[PDB]
Amino acid sequence: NMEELERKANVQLERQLVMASDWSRTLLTMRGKLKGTEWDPETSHRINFS
């Protein structure tokens, strides 16, 4: 039962981190503090299939 409780908490903390990460991502997106990184890139020249 203790293992059940702890692994419940383990997967629940995994979900905690993923939703909290998403919320922090969308919170930092608008303020422009993450400008230039891979989460807010800038346009450049076009490219082809080859």
Binding site for other proteins (CB under 8 A): 8, 11-12, 15-16, 18-24, 27
Cα 12 to Cα 45: distance, rounded to the nearest angstrom = 44
Closer residue to other proteins (CB): 4 or 45: 4
In the bound complex, what is the minimum distance in angstroms from residue 31's beta carbon to other proteins?
Answer: 8
Paired tokens of 24: 């922090």
In the bound complex, what is the minimum distance in angstroms from residue 42's beta carbon to other proteins?
Answer: 23
Cα 17 to Cα 3: distance, rounded to the nearest angstrom = 21
Closer residue to other proteins (CB): 3 or 45: 3
Cα 39 to Cα 25: distance, rounded to the nearest angstrom = 9
